[PDB]
Design a protein around this motif. Structure first.
Motif, mmCIF file in Angstrom:
data_model
loop_
_atom_site.group_PDB
_atom_site.id
_atom_site.type_symbol
_atom_site.label_atom_id
_atom_site.label_comp_id
_atom_site.label_asym_id
_atom_site.label_seq_id
_atom_site.Cartn_x
_atom_site.Cartn_y
_atom_site.Cartn_z
ATOM 1 N N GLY A 1 0.648 -0.986 -0.119
ATOM 2 C CA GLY A 1 0.486 -0.045 0.504
ATOM 3 C C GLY A 1 0.657 1.346 0.291
ATOM 4 N N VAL A 2 1.562 1.126 0.023
ATOM 5 C CA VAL A 2 3.346 2.623 0.172
ATOM 6 C C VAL A 2 2.889 3.677 -1.453
ATOM 7 N N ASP A 3 2.918 4.530 -0.754
ATOM 8 C CA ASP A 3 2.364 5.654 -1.827
ATOM 9 C C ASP A 3 3.876 5.979 -2.759
ATOM 10 N N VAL A 4 4.409 6.910 -2.116
ATOM 11 C CA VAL A 4 6.002 6.623 -2.676
ATOM 12 C C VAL A 4 7.165 6.456 -2.341
ATOM 13 N N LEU A 5 7.975 5.698 -3.300
ATOM 14 C CA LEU A 5 8.949 4.860 -3.394
ATOM 15 C C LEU A 5 10.377 5.484 -3.401
ATOM 16 N N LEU A 6 11.128 5.751 -2.242
ATOM 17 C CA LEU A 6 12.805 6.252 -2.357
ATOM 18 C C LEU A 6 13.427 4.812 -2.793
ATOM 19 N N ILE A 7 14.674 6.485 -3.463
ATOM 20 C CA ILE A 7 15.273 4.794 -3.540
ATOM 21 C C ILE A 7 16.979 6.017 -2.710
ATOM 22 N N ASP A 8 16.873 6.449 -2.033
ATOM 23 C CA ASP A 8 18.291 6.991 -1.054
ATOM 24 C C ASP A 8 19.324 6.467 -1.436
ATOM 25 N N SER A 9 20.321 7.415 -2.216
ATOM 26 C CA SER A 9 21.774 6.835 -2.822
ATOM 27 C C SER A 9 22.454 7.870 -2.157
ATOM 28 N N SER A 10 23.650 7.679 -2.365
ATOM 29 C CA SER A 10 24.677 8.981 -1.973
ATOM 30 C C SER A 10 25.228 9.258 -2.680
ATOM 31 N N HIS A 11 24.989 8.960 -4.286
ATOM 32 C CA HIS A 11 25.093 9.527 -5.025
ATOM 33 C C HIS A 11 24.191 9.710 -5.978
ATOM 34 N N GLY A 12 22.991 10.133 -6.641
ATOM 35 C CA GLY A 12 22.189 10.123 -7.309
ATOM 36 C C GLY A 12 22.414 10.858 -8.815
ATOM 37 N N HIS A 13 23.802 11.369 -8.678
ATOM 38 C CA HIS A 13 23.874 11.401 -10.411
ATOM 39 C C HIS A 13 24.672 10.618 -10.843
ATOM 40 N N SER A 14 24.779 9.001 -10.713
ATOM 41 C CA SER A 14 25.553 8.058 -10.693
ATOM 42 C C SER A 14 24.944 7.584 -12.005
ATOM 43 N N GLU A 15 24.978 6.896 -13.213
ATOM 44 C CA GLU A 15 25.086 6.459 -13.862
ATOM 45 C C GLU A 15 24.053 4.782 -13.850
#
Ligand SMILES: O=c1[nH]cnc2c1ncn2[C@@H]1O[C@H](COP(=O)(O)O)[C@@H](O)[C@H]1O
Ligand SMILES: O=c1[nH]cnc2c1ncn2[C@@H]1O[C@H](COP(=O)(O)O)[C@@H](O)[C@H]1O
Ligand SMILES: O=c1[nH]cnc2c1ncn2[C@@H]1O[C@H](COP(=O)(O)O)[C@@H](O)[C@H]1O
Ligand SMILES: O=c1[nH]cnc2c1ncn2[C@@H]1O[C@H](COP(=O)(O)O)[C@@H](O)[C@H]1O
Ligand SMILES: [K+]
Ligand SMILES: [K+]
Ligand SMILES: [K+]
Ligand SMILES: [K+]
Lengths: 334, 333, 334, 333
Positions: free
Chosen positions: B115-129
């Protein structure tokens, strides 16, 4: 009117700008050059100091891909003994330091006979003519011996060293942790500015730059390299480790070792750092992570294409751990 | 030449400017947006750290106008349970974090059907390929699932996330209280400058920007929004609370609770600060007193109209309590 | 893009530039204006706070040439009692503060009946319409009553207050020693910049500016005035003195008094300062000396023609006493 | 608009730049000039404070290449004696300070015939008309007496002194270790900027500039000269020494001696630093290591050729000892 040349920056004045990356930290290439003809597997070399580098550390460091520099606060034979001693440990590379004053004539001779891989002419002022002339005289005698001159912090100082015949220019006037030169003399240049200015000239000749002094955290390595350094010469990082000279001192609760300035310097104490191998592992783990953050596949990638942003003291305070009482200090956050 | 992009600033470097006001603090509209299609009653969200956000704090924050992101160091089945608990706890909205290792969609799959609404993919580097790639797949694999991407600290970084398919851009490279990334790697950008750079791009897509870290008081919340963030994410500010995971700790007369970062960080002690309901009122109270000062009716105005001034070190000491010795401490100080 | 308006400075960011002088410190004229129609003998007025100004201090201050402001944390009658009580002490001038919210209607009425010389409408945000309208309504009812509005820190905020009908604009959003407004809200302007910006507008109308909050040393007075202030409103300077409300507290060796913020403020303690008369003597002794150093014969001389130089934190550290262990602290170097 | 002339700097704000050098520190020519017609072997003079300079320290400093200025809070006859003592103590040069009250020429008269060489009229405001007037009279009353005027901190200030008839300009408004003038009055200019501004004018007349205060180490001495000063004046650096007036003081394991400023200042404790001969060698030693770094052969070169760089707060921490815990202190640190 006051004759101000420019504004100068050091390590805490800047931060590296994160960018697009196709590099994993465990896939970063740490290979670099110490001299024009000497390549390192890791961009780290030890300081040629009695409290930092003798034969024992120089071996452990060379095993990890770096190069140790034997200090000259010992007899020629003893210094020559340690070089060969290092040389006979699996074909390890080793440097040895000498004074710039006349009298090091046969000390250099023996070291060359001892099979030293790179000679370091050490001085407080690499841009002094007396030091420049010793390089010229040393260069002619050994036309293809790798020689490192220093220290300087300026472009012309880097330029003057190069035509003297150096294979690498060592940068750093004052930033030494145990150094008080900038205080006692009033002369010096903040290390980040020192590297870049020298980098601007050395790049013309394809000559590597060695950033010497001031590195306190693993992030400082990345900044020095991004400023233009091919590698860094450190003392306070190798002071403490088991392999370095001196015994461990238990004082007021914890362990220490002696770390002194080779008066311009001081005699101090520094936290025992266990085995060198772990220190480098921790130190090169921050660089690799940085090279992952900035999309730097190589050291040349970081050294030439990495960007900076200027920050305030408020920014640095934000960079550090803040507004919480640390209960478990990380080994790399010593 | 040393390659300096520009000078970057954070919270203590700047202050907001009072303008003509027709907004009383209590009347101020604190409503904002988390993502493209998800609103919030207050601009506060909680960090996905195992010492900050699980079901209880998520439920509490959601029952106050915010949303929580259940941390990921659990069994895949536990996080789905924690999400579900929040969902049945009054039909509250909820988020949760995942990684991007050789195998994560299983966790992603389990979370969505919780039932989750928003998925978070917390990374230490969002601009990595890899992150950028892992974001495109998920958006392809889940076209209507609201996706939060990050972290970034540049203008060009937020662009990639948005073009990769994120519903929101999260901003933060090394400013967290427990963070040592900038010290260990030398990489990072001061939060406020980092906020403005991402926002400047994300606003043109109409994409919300989230401020992740560096918030010590309610004043920082105001500044983070004014710089361009549609909402803020906090860790230490919510840590230590009752609803925050962990027993209370007794240490030398003072009470605490644990707070660990997820070697890029450390572990330490944060002060005990009562029920979460009490914290938010004070933090929103200061924010209300800000909007009243700025004449900002809604979050958007503060976010887009409010002006800053650059201050010095002395200007930051004049801001805090000086001269006097604190005899009776204030709740927000 | 970040919407930065400008750079802003406070007291420790600047220093007054010494100049040619034909004025002795004991010959400096400290006469100034509180309002457009009210002149002071010394450029000091007290803060309208429960821990700072009641009837007792307001008398002692008025005797020295300043004006006290009765705080509004009491009943109307009691507040009206203190004004008259001050009025009947040799024809002393006195101000009285009120809230900006509706309900202060008859409190103002009584104070006017009590013969208050200047009304202060107090608010955290002088540039708010609700506060602006209370001034307009108050101005019409008493067309020639001297009224002070605040607080603001901007030019338009000063401009908005003026057309509302104020006789003086009070400047200061955040710099209060017991204030945390800038921290809790994130809103505020460093006081030096705050004064000058408001001074730029108030000068057009010949309306005096009151610098409120942030003054910690006597040198701060000179800077506030030079920034454009006609006088300064202080709390931490009158907190401690015998005449101020509250009894003396002996704590951990020394004497103290209670000084609290009227949450935006805090409840604190401040060093007991003996008799007010000496404090003003010490405080106005620094101004007179400053007016001697900058060739300022009058306050208008300092307020309009004095120059500044910007300094660093290193400069401020040099300004303070440094590199010596003080053994006898001066009463003005508290 | 706020009337800001310019941004002003002092010692900790700047550093000197190493140039090509043909000067070994030991060979360096430290010779300079105190006034128009008075040379010095070293660029150091002592402050006219009753806790710094009387006969013994004056004799010691003079027997090392400097000059002392006997303070003025004595009987008129005592100061003349103190001057004379220095004069017979090896034919040493000597200075002495006077004021400018309703009656001072009597003291001035007595000092000249004591064999005094340079008259100092140390004021807290050199650019005041009274001082400027009192200087013109003295020059008229004593046309060949070398006169030192001050203190000033601007370009226009030094101009007046020179046109009033001074032989040398002294610079310093509030930078002294014991000084509270800047705090009490708000008036002053950071020393290095103050040095450069006066020098820029005084050099065109060929008039020497003296740096009075703010010197904590030998490095400051180098910077003060490079900014334009022909010599420096110190108070704390020479205070505490044996030859400095006062018994040694024992306080909590550490040894001291008194140091009082002449309410514009305070009184405090300065550390005991042995015989004055020992201090000067270290302070000149650091200066020699400076000239060697800069490639400066003489004081004039360092004063006129040496370049500065502006540093930050971090740059000043990198300069001092960092990281290491001092186990064996250095004489100059
Ligand atoms: O006495 C000395 N003279 C000149 N440089 C020194 C001396 N002692 C240490 N250093 C410098 O200081 C560096 C070590 O500083 P650290 O790595 O910051 O602790 C060395 O590698 C040298 O460059
Ligand atoms: O251990 C870690 N290393 C680096 N960053 C972290 C770590 N743990 C949390 N963070 C970041 O710091 C934020 C919380 O910071 P805070 O709100 O200032 O306490 C989180 O939302 C993450 O973005
Ligand atoms: O609670 C309050 N609300 C708004 N301003 C206050 C409050 N308490 C104190 N102040 C301000 O702070 C000033 C005193 O600060 P100080 O003179 O620096 O100690 C007062 O004159 C007011 O301007
Ligand atoms: O008490 C005083 N008030 C202000 N300045 C003083 C006082 N006493 C000495 N000075 C100045 O400070 C200088 C010495 O400062 P120092 O060399 O830094 O200790 C003297 O030569 C005077 O110019
Ligand atoms: K951090
Ligand atoms: K404050
Ligand atoms: K001072
Ligand atoms: K150093």
């Amino acid at each position: 009117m006051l004759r101000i040349a420019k504004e100068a920056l050091t390590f805490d004045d800047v931060l590296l700008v994160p960018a697009h990356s196709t590099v994993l930290p465990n896939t970063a290439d740490l290979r670099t050059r110490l001299t024009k003809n000497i390549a390192l597997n890791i961009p780290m070399v030890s300081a040629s100091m009695d409290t930092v580098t003798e034969a024992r550390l120089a071996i452990a460091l060379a095993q990890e891909g770096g190069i140790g520099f034997i200090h000259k606060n010992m007899s020629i034979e003893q210094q020559a003994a340690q070089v060969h001693q290092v040389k006979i440990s699996g074909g390890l590379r080793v440097g040895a330091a000498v004074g710039a004053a006349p009298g090091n004539e046969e000390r250099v001779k023996a070291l060359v006979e001892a099979g030293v891989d790179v000679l370091l002419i050490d001085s407080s002022h690499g841009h002094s003519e007396g030091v420049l002339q010793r390089i010229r005289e040393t260069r002619a005698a050994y036309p293809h011996l790798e020689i490192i001159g220093g220290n300087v912090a300026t472009a012309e100082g880097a330029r003057a060293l190069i035509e003297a015949g150096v294979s690498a220019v060592k940068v750093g006037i004052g930033p030494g942790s145990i150094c008080t030169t900038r205080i006692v003399t009033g002369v010096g240049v903040p290390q980040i500015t020192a590297i870049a200015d020298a980098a601007g000239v050395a790049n013309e000749y394809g000559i590597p730059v060695i950033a010497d002094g001031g590195i306190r955290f693993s992030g400082d390595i990345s900044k020095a390299i991004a400023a233009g350094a091919s590698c860094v010469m450190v003392g306070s990082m190798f002071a403490g480790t088991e392999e370095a000279p001196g015994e461990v001192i238990l004082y007021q609760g914890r362990s220490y070792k002696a770390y002194r300035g080779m008066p311009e310097g001081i005699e101090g104490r520094i936290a025992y750092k266990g085995h060198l191998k772990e220190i480098i592992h921790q130190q090169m783990g921050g660089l690799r992570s940085c090279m992952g953050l900035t999309g730097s596949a190589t050291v040349e990638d970081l050294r030439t294409k990495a960007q900076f942003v200027r920050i305030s003291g408020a920014g640095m305070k934000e960079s550090h751990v803040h507004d919480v009482q640390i209960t478990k200090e990380a080994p790399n956050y010593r």
